[PDB]
Ligand SMILES: O=P(O)(O)C(O)(Cn1ccnc1)P(=O)(O)O
Ligand SMILES: O=P(O)(O)C(O)(Cn1ccnc1)P(=O)(O)O
């Protein structure tokens with residue numbers, strides 16, 4: 001029955017596009033912006049954006065949840081979707097990806113190519129444009145600007161670490177450690193994916209306390225780590241008709257949770273098979289790596305990890321949710337661990 | 339004797355790098371950030387960054403120009419250099435450029451490639467990192483954040499217009515009009531190049547009035563337009579040992595001031611020579627376009643335009659400089675029209 005809360009959020013995208021596309025000299029650039037927005041911020045699950053709206057309603061007194069306050073909540077929710085769209089458009093280029101959300105990657109579109117770099121930058125610019133148009137006169141205005149900027153910097157540090165640990169055509173198996181893996185996922189996914197939308201609803205509700213944001217981070221950073229580990233598992237073992245994207249981690253020589261777990265269980269012979277076949281474009285070599293992972297029962301190791309993680313996150317909710325409603329984190333835990 | 343004001347600004351870059359590179363888990367990403375900063379924000383003329391410092395000293399009472407206020411002025415000056423570095427790293431990729439500031443473009447460096455997209459994003463992130471570390475407790479903090487964000491959005495709209503008017507392998511001569519040209523340069527260069535550093539010094543001096551910023555824009559936007567027209571002229575007729583970069587406008591099918599002026603003077607036969615030779619990679623075809631421009635006396639047309647522009651900008655300074663010191667704009671006019 002949660003498809004209704006989604007439907008309302010999706011319906012507000014038309015308003016977001018209209019407001020951002022409203023100078024006859026910039027008309028052609030405005031039309032390109034509309035195309036970028038429609039192609040990239042639509043076709044997703046909108047869970048990150050929806051988390052702003054859902055948490056806003058659960059943290060703000062209903063008497064203060066007026067039409068304009070709710071409008072501001074939907075807008076900031078769409079700002080989170082725009083931040084994600086900015087990072088994914090650029091990430092698809094850098095990871096040489098083919099598809100995203102059941103369609104070809106925006107940069108792979110004939111006539112787009114590397115112009116997608118500027119398109120990604122425009123998506124980022126739209127966030128601060130919406131924050132100014134809707135939240136400029138709000139006491140949480142600077143809190144939100146700083147939150148989106150800090151989330152961007154943390155994601156970009158994470159992306160730097162992801163790209164450095166994955167050099168094209170260079171055997172970096174020794175660098176694929178558990179400590180290295182935890183550092184990457186913390187920065188590249190955990191902050192913008194779960195802390196950002198909840199923290200935004202918190203600042204909008206007047207919850208600006210350092211300790212409250214610290215406690216919320218304790219739960220959400222661990223949820224973010226799980227989500228990235230699940231993303232790494234699905235890169236190879238997920239159904240592309242469900243994920244909407246084709247995996248590239250093995251070909252891209254990425255420090256995937258799968259390769260880290262492989263190296264913790266591989267014999268010296270299995271290690272050599274991995275060394276000779278990892279980080280290469282040949283379909284035959286990728287297939288050999290997948291066979292190795294299946295031989296080492298990594299899908300069963302992931303299933304066990306998912307159960308241990310769920311139990312750990314629920315224990316963190318019991319420890320750190322107060323004084324916030326547990327439903328804020330429980331709703332998020334249900335969607336991610338389904 | 340103005341080389342001394344430059345030397346001091348350059349000496350402060352070591353502090354900027356140290357502060358931005360100071361978590362052992364992010365160590366490798368921090369080392370990559372230092373490399374990106376050193377490669378891209380050094381080797382330039384630093385005129386945009388220096389304009390912050392010079393205008394700060396000319397707008398703030400010397401009694402308020404303490405060591406910490408001056409430190410904040412140098413930092414915001416380096417923030418302007420970082421914004422420019424962010425845009426140029428991404429612009430070199432999208433324009434398929436070879437060199438910048440006498441060295442190969444960062445993305446052309448072996449082992450960098452499209453990872454430069456994230457490097458460019460990190461340079462942008464460093465701006466807001468420095469603004470928070472040095473200007474967070476200042477009354478102009480939000481004014482500066484909004485100024486850098488708005489300057490980014492205007493530049494990105496300009497870049498969109500530049501890339502749309504220049505499609506790869508598509509004859510777009512009819513689109514190369516004077517109105518189209520003025521629209522592109524206004525957004526892609528004029529705002530971040532001259533309005534941004536002066537407006538920053540103004541906000542730092544407590545000059546936040548809408549009319550004062552409007553009047554300053556009247557002069558600086560026209561200075562920005564001239565600088566972009568000069569950039570277009572130098573793309574083909576400039577000495578690469580002086581400019582530090584190799585021209586790509588003809589090959590890239592750009593709506594250059596040169597091609598716009600060509601079309602205003604070309605006969606139907608000269609138009610066909612331009613049509614058959616513009617926007618193509620062949621050295622022979624680029625050479626034919628350059629011969630056409632030289633035949634149509636475009637270098638003499640530019641020299642005349644430079645004189646008319648200088649006189650127009652000085653007339654704008656007389657009309658709109660007050661109540662600011664004219665030296666603020668005169669110093670900038672001397673550096674650009676030299
Ligand atoms: O595996 P990635 O980290 O590249 C990914 O999760 C994207 N991403 C990029 C930064 N954080 C997440 P996706 O698999 O969607 O391509
Ligand atoms: O000619 P462009 O507009 O690409 C240039 O001026 C860069 N640029 C990009 C946006 N504004 C200016 P450069 O000749 O340095 O490559």
Ligand SMILES: [Mg+2]
Pocket residue numbers: 091092095097
């Ligand atoms: Mg990816």
Ligand SMILES: [Mg+2]
Pocket residue numbers: 091095162
């Ligand atoms: Mg990636």
Ligand SMILES: [Mg+2]
Pocket residue numbers: 231232235
């Ligand atoms: Mg992935």
Ligand SMILES: [Mg+2]
Pocket residue numbers: 429430433435
């Ligand atoms: Mg260029």
Ligand SMILES: [Mg+2]
Pocket residue numbers: 429433500
């Ligand atoms: Mg360009």
Ligand SMILES: [Mg+2]
Pocket residue numbers: 569570573
């Ligand atoms: Mg140029």
